[PDB]
From Swiss-Prot, chain A:
Changing K41N: In strain: Beta/B.1.351, Omicron/BA.1, Omicron/BA.2, Omicron/BA.2.12.1, Omicron/BA.2.75, Omicron/BA.4, Omicron/BA.5, Omicron/BQ.1.1, Omicron/XBB.1.5, Omicron/EG.5.1; May enhance affinity to human ACE2 receptor. Attaches the virion to the cell membrane by interacting with host receptor, initiating the infection. The major receptor is host ACE2. When S2/S2' has been cleaved, binding to the receptor triggers direct fusion at the cell membrane. When S2/S2' has not been cleaved, binding to the receptor results in internalization of the virus by endocytosis using host TFRC and GRM2 and leading to fusion of the virion membrane with the host endosomal membrane. Alternatively, may use NRP1/NRP2 and integrin as entry receptors. This is Spike protein S1. The gene is S. Binds to host ACE2. RBD also interacts with the N-linked glycan on 'Asn-90' of ACE2. Cleavage of S generates a polybasic C-terminal sequence on S1 that binds to host Neuropilin-1 (NRP1) and Neuropilin-2 (NRP2) receptors. Interacts with host integrin alpha-5/beta-1 (ITGA5:ITGB1) and with ACE2 in complex with integrin alpha-5/beta-1 (ITGA5:ITGB1). May interact via cytoplasmic c-terminus with M protein. May interact (via N-terminus) with host bilirubin and biliverdin, thereby preventing antibody binding to the SARS-CoV-2 spike NTD via an allosteric mechanism. Residues 27-29 are annotated as: Integrin-binding motif. The lineage of its organism: Viruses, Riboviria, Orthornavirae, Pisuviricota, Pisoniviricetes. Changing R32S: In strain: Omicron/BA.2, Omicron/BA.2.12.1, Omicron/BA.2.75, Omicron/BA.4, Omicron/BA.5, Omicron/BQ.1.1, Omicron/XBB.1.5, Omicron/EG.5.1.
UniProtKB/Swiss-Prot annotation, chain B:
The lineage of its organism: Viruses, Riboviria, Orthornavirae, Pisuviricota, Pisoniviricetes. Binds to host ACE2. RBD also interacts with the N-linked glycan on 'Asn-90' of ACE2. Cleavage of S generates a polybasic C-terminal sequence on S1 that binds to host Neuropilin-1 (NRP1) and Neuropilin-2 (NRP2) receptors. Interacts with host integrin alpha-5/beta-1 (ITGA5:ITGB1) and with ACE2 in complex with integrin alpha-5/beta-1 (ITGA5:ITGB1). May interact via cytoplasmic c-terminus with M protein. May interact (via N-terminus) with host bilirubin and biliverdin, thereby preventing antibody binding to the SARS-CoV-2 spike NTD via an allosteric mechanism. Residues 1-18 are annotated as: Disordered. Attaches the virion to the cell membrane by interacting with host receptor, initiating the infection. The major receptor is host ACE2. When S2/S2' has been cleaved, binding to the receptor triggers direct fusion at the cell membrane. When S2/S2' has not been cleaved, binding to the receptor results in internalization of the virus by endocytosis using host TFRC and GRM2 and leading to fusion of the virion membrane with the host endosomal membrane. Alternatively, may use NRP1/NRP2 and integrin as entry receptors. This is Spike protein S1. The gene is S. The chain holds residues 524 to 573 of 1273 of the full protein.
């Protein structure tokens, strides 16, 4: 459970105009590519943040 | 989309610590005579502060 | 020539009033001081809106979003920028003051 632009315990104090839940299945070793600033088979050609 | 927080009543014309939809600060809340349009949520100063 | 001299003097003063009344460019030297000081402060205030590498220019928005271990980093970015802004302002005021 990793947050980048916010801290995970501040989430209940904040209020947003839109929340989008992007949902998909990948293999465990490539979970680390689901982050800002990443490269790799998924990060560059499949799913990018 | 707001978190599980309980709202309270607003106190006018006093120095208060406020939180409006996650927007926080300290100041006195008073009735405005500003002509807000139906779509405008808040206004800003030259300093880019609320 | 006392009558001539007094009359020329009195006329000359009347001319000063007309010159000053007609155009404000006459006092550009004093207006320039006012304008430069106003600009120095307008610049200083506008700098508050800059991010300087931070995620947000607003200190309260950083604090309401991040825990201290991360909030401090974003704040240091704003402090460096804002402190540098004051140093620029003060230096300019000292030189202008001279």
């Amino acid at each position: 459970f990793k947050c980048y632009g916010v801290s995970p315990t501040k989430l209940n104090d904040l209020c947003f105009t839109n929340v989008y839940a992007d949902s998909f299945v990948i293999r465990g070793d490539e979970v680390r590519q689901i982050a800002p600033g990443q490269t790799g088979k998924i990060a560059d050609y499949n799913y990018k943040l | 989309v707001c978190g599980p927080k309980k709202s309270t009543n607003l106190v006018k014309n006093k120095c208060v610590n406020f939180n409006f939809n996650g927007l926080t600060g300290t100041g006195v809340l008073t009735e405005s005579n500003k002509k807000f349009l139906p779509f405008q949520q808040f206004g800003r100063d030259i300093a880019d502060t609320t | 020539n006392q009558k001539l001299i007094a009359n020329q003097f009195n006329s000359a003063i009347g001319k000063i009033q007309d010159s000053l009344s007609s155009t404000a460019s006459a006092l550009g030297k004093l207006q320039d001081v006012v304008n430069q000081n106003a600009q120095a402060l307008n610049t200083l205030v506008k700098q508050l809106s800059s991010n300087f590498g931070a995620i947000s220019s607003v200190l309260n928005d950083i604090l309401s979003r991040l825990d201290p271990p991360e909030a401090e980093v974003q704040i240091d970015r704003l402090i460096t920028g804002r402190l540098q802004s004051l140093q620029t302002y003060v230096t300019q005021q000292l030189i202008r003051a001279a």
